[PDB]
Amino acid sequence: FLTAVSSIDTFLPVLNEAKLQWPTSALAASSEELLGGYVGSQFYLQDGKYMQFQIAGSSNRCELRQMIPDGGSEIGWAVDDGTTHTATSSIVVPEQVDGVEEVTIMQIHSGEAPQLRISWIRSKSLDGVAYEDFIMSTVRIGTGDSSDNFVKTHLADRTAGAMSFQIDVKDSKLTITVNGNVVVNGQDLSFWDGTDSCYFKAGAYNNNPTSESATARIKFAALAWVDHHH
Ligand SMILES: O=C(O)[C@H]1O[C@@H](O[C@H]2[C@H](O)[C@H](O)[C@H](O[C@H]3[C@H](O)[C@H](O)[C@@H](O)O[C@@H]3C(=O)O)O[C@@H]2C(=O)O)[C@@H](O)[C@@H](O)[C@@H]1O
Ligand SMILES: O=C(O)[C@H]1O[C@@H](O[C@H]2[C@H](O)[C@H](O)[C@H](O[C@H]3[C@H](O)[C@H](O)[C@H](O)O[C@@H]3C(=O)O)O[C@H]2C(=O)O)[C@@H](O)[C@@H](O)[C@@H]1O
Ligand SMILES: [Cl-]
């Protein structure tokens, strides 16, 4: 039988501050249900250690969405509220099966748009450089569709072993740290000033596959939203 993520202590803090959305943004499990042992092939404990997310289908997801702690409702914060908002993770990204092209593994999202997606990418050229099998950040600096609305950055080549990530937002600036090294330093988020509906997400969100049957799979060794106010 499939072992539940809540059967160990590692993820209890974030599970107390998240709902699970699967296979769309519809609710799969409340925070209470997650802490109570919700489990399925889409969301189970792998190797006695990893919170594993799986999903197939274009734009489908198996993803945690930040909630107010202790059974609270959906959280919303602003990039310019003066507080540091922080998400940390340690992720084992396995080799992805054929047909999977991009898997978003962490986000800052609002009621209308993704401010930031950290994603695994099979193959893409950025600023005239081709990259394969890598982790990318995609930041929106507008709501348009043209390339001027995005800043897309190679963060790191995918590693077989766990890779640590940290996202920090303070005073309308974004920092991304990968394996302890700052890769994105003070990216401007001021376009989003006054948007009070931002929140963190993490898991597996499957983007532009070439087969809707192909199952994305992502293993978290750690995940937390870090409250700077205690
Ligand atoms: O390699 C490129 O730059 C391609 O970008 C394509 O447009 C992207 C866009 O830059 C961005 O990555 C966007 O991300 C969306 C995501 O896939 C999900 O649909 C959801 O999270 O919404 C995101 C968003 O709207 O920000 O996806 C589009 C896309 O539809 O592919 C094209 O411009 C492409 O021609 C170009 O090669
Ligand atoms: O296009 C998407 O799939 C986006 O969905 C986002 O989640 C929303 C979405 O509305 C979703 O259906 C669900 O809505 C809930 C929620 O309670 C909301 O407040 C609404 O008023 O009632 C719905 C309910 O009771 O089930 O959750 C929403 C949310 O913000 O969490 C995100 O998953 C986006 O990332 C996504 O692009
Ligand atoms: Cl992208």
What is the 3 state secondary structure string of 94-141?
Answer: CCCCCCCCEEEEEEEECCCCEEEEEEEEEEEEECCEEEEEEEEEEEEC
CA distance 150 to 187: 11
Q: Among 105, 115, 117, which is best to mutate for testing ligand 1, by the most ligand atoms less than 8 A from CB?
A: 117
The closest of 2, 11, 33, 22 to 205, measured between CA atoms, is 22
Cα three-residue angle 106-200-158, rounded to 5 degrees:
10
If you measure from the C-alpha of residue 22 to the centroid of ligand 3, how many angstroms do you get, rounded to a whole number? 21
CA distance 31 to 35: 6
DSSP bridge partners of 158: none
Residue 93 is given by DSSP the state -
Establish whether the linkage from the previous residue to 23 is cis, with ω within 30° of 0.
Answer: yes
Resolution in A: 1.1
Tokens of 59: 């734009």
DSSP bridge partners of 57: none
Tokens of 190: 């001021």
If you measure from the C-alpha of residue 230 to the centroid of ligand 1, how many angstroms do you get, rounded to a whole number? 37
Q: Are 53 and 47 spatial neighbours (Cβ–Cβ below 8 Å)? A: no
Establish whether residue 208 lines the binding site of ligand 1, counting it when its CB lies within 6 angstroms of any ligand atom: yes
If you measure from the C-alpha of residue 124 to the centroid of ligand 3, how many angstroms do you get, rounded to a whole number? 9
Which ligand approaches the C-alpha of residue 18 most closely?
Answer: 2
Taking the CA of residue 27 as reference, the ligand 2 atom at the shortest distance is 26
Establish whether residue 21 lines the binding site of ligand 1, counting it when its CB lies within 6 angstroms of any ligand atom: no
The closest of 141, 107, 137 to 121, measured between CA atoms, is 137
Q: Edge to edge, what strands does the sheet with 85-92 contain? A: 43-46, 50-56, 215-227, 85-92, 163-170, 173-178, 181-188
Which ligand approaches the C-alpha of residue 29 most closely?
Answer: 2
Which ligand approaches the C-alpha of residue 72 most closely?
Answer: 2
Give the CA distances from residue 4 to residues 47, 52, 70, 83, 92, in Å, rounded to whole numbers and listed in that order. Answer: 11, 10, 20, 34, 18
Tokens of 187: 């990216």
CA distance 26 to 60: 10
The closest of 15, 91, 100 to 55, measured between CA atoms, is 100
Ligand 2 shell residues, CB under 6 Å: 21, 24-27, 65, 74, 109
CA distance 1 to 174: 41
Q: Are 196 and 74 spatial neighbours (Cβ–Cβ below 8 Å)? A: no
- Nearest residue by C-alpha to atom 1 in ligand 2: 25
DSSP bridge partners of 85: 169, 227
Report phi then psi at 6, rounded to 5: -75, 0
Contacts of 109 (CB under 8 A, 6+ apart): 115, 198, 199, 201
